[PDB]
Amino acid sequence: PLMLDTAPNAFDDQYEGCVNKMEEKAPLLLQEDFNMNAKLKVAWEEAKKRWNNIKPSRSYPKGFNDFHGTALVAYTGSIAVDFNRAVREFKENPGQFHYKAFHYYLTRALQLLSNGDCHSVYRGTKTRFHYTGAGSVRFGQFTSSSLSKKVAQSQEFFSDHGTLFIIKTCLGVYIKEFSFRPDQEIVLIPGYEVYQKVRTQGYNEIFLDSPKRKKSNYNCLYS
Ligand SMILES: NC(=O)c1ccc[n+]([C@@H]2O[C@@H](COP(=O)([O-])OP(=O)(O)OC[C@H]3O[C@@H](n4cnc5c(N)ncnc54)[C@H](O)[C@@H]3O)[C@@H](O)[C@H]2O)c1
Numbered sequence: 214p215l216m217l218d219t220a221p222n223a224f225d226d227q228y229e230g231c232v233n234k235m236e237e238k239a240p241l242l243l244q245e246d247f248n249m250n251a252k253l254k255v256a257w258e259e260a261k262k263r264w265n266n267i268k269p270s271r272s273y274p275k276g277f278n279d280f281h282g283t284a285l286v287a288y289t290g291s292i293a294v295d296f297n298r299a300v301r302e303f304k305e306n307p308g309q310f311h312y313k314a315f316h317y318y319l320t321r322a323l324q325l326l327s328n329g330d331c332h333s334v335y336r337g338t339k340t341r342f343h344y345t346g347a348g349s350v351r352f353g354q355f356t357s358s359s360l361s362k363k364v365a366q367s368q369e370f371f372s373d374h375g376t377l378f379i380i381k382t383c384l385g386v387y388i389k390e391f392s393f394r395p396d397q398e399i400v401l402i403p404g405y406e407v408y409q410k411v412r413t414q415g416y417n418e419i420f421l422d423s424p425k426r427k428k429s430n431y432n433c434l435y436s
Pocket of ligand 1: 215216289290293294297301335336337338339340356357358359364365366370392397398399
């Protein structure tokens with residue numbers, strides 16, 4: 214079982230007040246990441262190709278560049294697990310965080326593609342999640358979900374040993390074209406979104422409601 218709390222140790226940078234400085238610094242940062250993170254480098258190079266193919270079929274937000282696009286395609290890829298881990302366990306040893314640039318671009322990508330829109334999404338896991346009664350909840354790491362409860366419950370993501378999250382999010386982003394699917398109706402949720410209403414039902418169902426945007430514990434850490 215894993216704990217569900219306010220994710221006090223997760224690198225949750227929202228980059229308030231440093232977007233301009235980051236867009237200028239992140240490119241160098243990305244090189245540093247690659248030098249210390251072979252897996253990321255591979256994931257990114259492949260993601261880059263894919264993005265070249267996807268980019269022409271549609272128009273993106275002003276400022277939304279190849280870094281944002283490549284970062285997002287990559288997240289829907291296999292690099293997601295390690296990245297999520299590194300973020301979730303940031304405070305546990307911030308010295309070995311080699312996703313400084315990745316984190317920023319992915320965070321920025323979602324912020325740029327975002328609107329006021331809220332969604333009813335579902336998320337399945339094969340690991341039991343226990344809410345430790347903090348009063349509110351944040352995933353900490355970025356977290357994928359699906360508009361379809363069917364997907365979330367498929368043998369792909371869920372099992373009796375796990376948990377089914379029924380989430381009401383307003384910072385989540387529908388990123389169909391970016392995914393490798395595109396049939397899982399993925400909605401990407403930033404780890405810093407806060408759910409003011411938490412409710413466990415049965416042994417493996419958790420409802421998260423009253424989403425709200427709050428300040429993060431970290432801000433412009435690498436700016
Ligand atoms: N999960 C879903 O319901 C769902 C739905 C649609 C698409 N996807 C897709 O999922 C991808 C994989 O994302 P994911 O859903 O597996 O997230 P993820 O891989 O983090 O989830 C798997 C698990 O990863 C590690 N983990 C996650 N949170 C943890 C925590 N708080 N503490 C300790 N370990 C933790 C644990 O093993 C956790 O059980 C891509 O394929 C994406 O398109 C997932």
